[PDB]
Symmetry: C4
Subunit: 56 residues, 4 copies
Amino acid sequence: HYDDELFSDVQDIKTALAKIHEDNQKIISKLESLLLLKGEVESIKKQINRQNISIS
Amino acid sequence: YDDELFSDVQDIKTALAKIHEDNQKIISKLESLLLLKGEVESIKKQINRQN
Amino acid sequence: HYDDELFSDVQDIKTALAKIHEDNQKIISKLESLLLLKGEVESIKKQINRQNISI
Amino acid sequence: DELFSDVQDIKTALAKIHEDNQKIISKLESLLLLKGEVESIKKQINRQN
């Protein structure tokens, strides 16, 4: 059959998987947030290149 | 193979599959983020020349 | 009922999930630490625009 | 029998996830080094001012 302790173990696996999934959704959105650094860093690089055009 | 156990196992399978795919998405986003190292290194270099 | 070897397999599965959960917590805090880069990068941008008004 | 096969596939999937996790942590540790670097850049921008 479906033994009670096996059942219990399965429930805890369910809980843990569910925690893992939601943590992954946090991970992903933090990453989406961090990826915005690429353009910003690119802008700094661009500004530093206009700045280095300082024939003074 | 109890039907309910069976159902539970399939649900675990779905969750694992989803987790795995999220992992590949995370890795790729990370591979992209890693390109920042060279860019930041480059800015540092430009800033030192600028000095 | 709950067969000995299935039982052994379930415990190993439990061990792996625990480890995975843990690595996730460490991953999350590393990410929270990296997110501070946003403000810092923003400051740099600002202090460089300030510099550009060098004329 | 079929449950056995399912458990093996779960074990496979778990191992893969775990290993991606080690690759993720390592990429992250490398990314963490960016903290000192932009701190330096920040410092050299202040000195430039």
